[PDB]
């Protein structure tokens, strides 16, 4: 039996949860730690069809929705792109949130590039591919 594939996914999830935790406790990214509240931003749902935030990323780790770093960074990229699509550039608060969105993306990418073994990631990607096939 090849339970080694599951060992890969277990180690991936532990790594993803640790990365997400480090993003979620960074004061810069507090705005991305909870879903956008339509009571405070009533037009958000009219711009953004696929909302995403760091607490939802945690839930998706728990539910085994990330088999690859690519799948995970897709959701980090979604947090960023939603913020850049939704938020205008009209006052200093707008500029601040947009900068934090890019810094979230860049921080997640930099951590993964520094800390993630390339062969481990490729193995995860290719198990996902074998399971698709």
């Amino acid at each position: 039996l090849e339970e080694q594939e599951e060992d890969t996914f277990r180690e991936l999830r532990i790594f993803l949860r640790n990365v997400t935790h480090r993003l979620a406790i960074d004061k810069r990214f507090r705005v991305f730690t909870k879903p956008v509240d339509p009571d405070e931003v009533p037009d958000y749902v009219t711009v953004i069809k696929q909302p995403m935030d760091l607490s939802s990323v945690i839930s998706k780790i728990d539910l085994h929705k990330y088999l690859t770093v690519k799948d995970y960074l897709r959701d980090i990229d979604l947090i960023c792109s939603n913020a850049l699509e939704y938020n205008p550039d009209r006052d200093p608060g707008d500029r601040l949130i947009r900068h934090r969105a890019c810094a979230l993306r860049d921080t997640a990418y930099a951590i993964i590039k520094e800390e993630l073994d390339e062969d481990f990631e490729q193995l995860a990607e290719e198990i996902q591919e074998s399971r698709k096939k």
Partner: peptide, 7 residues
């Protein structure tokens, strides 16, 4: 883009 979150 939308209204923004400044209120």
């Amino acid at each position: 883009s939308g209204r923004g979150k400044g209120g």
